[PDB]
Design a protein around this ligand. Structure first.
Ligand code: ZN
Length: 334
């Protein structure tokens, strides 16, 4: 059980609002930087068209879902006109050949074809913009997660404010990178939307079953989420599913389209405990009011890593002691 928090003063609550809103303005991309991502797509499409005529490239992921950061990886989906589907298409061979085509591009570095994962991709670094780029073939389920999240973000501005706040919180606690043992940005976003669907009154519906009645400020909702996932939610009798309103029985997070995909499947237990521990601290920092008269930056007070995680690193027992990423032993690392 947790220690109760004192009541919220309208002043401190007004400050929590500004912090949640600033998490969006400070770290979402500008319109010029989004246009720069579009220009990258156009010039890759023309370059690949030389060796794969009919190529069509589309941006998905953080680039288009309305929750991406600056310096987020640019995720590209590749299709070929006349090839309605990838049925029969040898994706590995295509990815490998694509990698060799891109090595002749003067603006790209560290071309890397990866066929390990479920979906093979080509990875490379783009110098003109300092972004990592991932090209995959016919990744339509990814483009559907994007269209779904993009729809929720446009229903209420508080959706984007909160998802960005969550994104800053997890990134600052070092618990928001799936490749290193923790949970992905997508997972933490689903936890946000799910909390908003379950809030009484609801802030967002379940678009997979089909109005502004919730009048709580973003600050109230942010702390509400921290108290929701720290005090009430039963993490192993209920499944975090934005798919529908009714509570689903068996951290478990269900992908709204791939219903066999549990986003928390690869979670250890000292990471699960480390994650929960970060939320309990956030509950304290954001819920318990010298502030504001001796702190030059409010961001640095609320998102202090030495307070949210108590000066401890994220566990990485699974991880290569050289790269720090999961997925391979210490012998086969780049
Ligand atoms: Zn490694």
């Amino acid at each position: 059980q947790l220690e109760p928090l004192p009541p919220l003063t309208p002043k401190f609550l007004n400050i929590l609002d500004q912090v949640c809103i600033q998490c969006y303005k400070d770290f979402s991309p500008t319109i010029i930087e989004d246009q720069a991502r579009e220009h990258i797509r156009q010039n890759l499409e023309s370059f690949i068209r030389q060796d794969f005529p009919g190529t069509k490239l589309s941006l998905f992921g953080s680039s288009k879902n309305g929750f991406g950061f600056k310096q987020s990886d640019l995720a590209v989906c590749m299709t070929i006109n006349g090839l309605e589907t990838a049925e029969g298409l040898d994706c590995v061979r295509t990815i490998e050949e694509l990698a060799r085509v891109l090595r002749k591009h003067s603006g790209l570095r560290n071309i890397l074809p990866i066929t390990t994962a479920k979906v093979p991709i080509v990875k490379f670094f783009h110098l003109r913009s300092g972004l990592e780029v991932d090209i995959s073939l016919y990744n339509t389920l990814a483009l559907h997660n994007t269209r779904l999240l993009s729809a929720y973000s446009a229903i209420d501005p508080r959706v984007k404010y909160l998802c960005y706040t969550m994104k800053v919180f997890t990134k600052m606690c070092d618990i928001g990178d799936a490749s290193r043992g923790s949970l992905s940005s997508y997972a933490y976003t689903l936890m946000v939307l799910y909390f908003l669907q379950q809030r009484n009154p609801p802030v967002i519906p379940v678009l997979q079953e089909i109005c502004g009645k919730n009048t709580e400020s973003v600050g109230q909702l942010w702390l509400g989420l921290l108290r929701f996932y720290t005090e009430e939610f039963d993490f192993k009798e209920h499944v975090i599913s934005i798919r529908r309103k009714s509570l689903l029985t068996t951290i478990v997070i269900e992908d709204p389209f791939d219903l066999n995909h549990n986003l928390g499947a690869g979670l250890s237990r000292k990471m699960t405990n480390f994650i929960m521990k970060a939320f309990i601290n956030g509950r304290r920092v954001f819920g318990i009011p010298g502030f504001p008269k001796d702190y030059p930056s409010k961001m640095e007070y609320f998102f202090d890593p030495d307070v949210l995680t108590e000066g401890e690193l994220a566990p990485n027992d699974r991880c290569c002691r050289i790269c720090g990423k999961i997925g391979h032993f210490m012998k086969d690392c780049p």
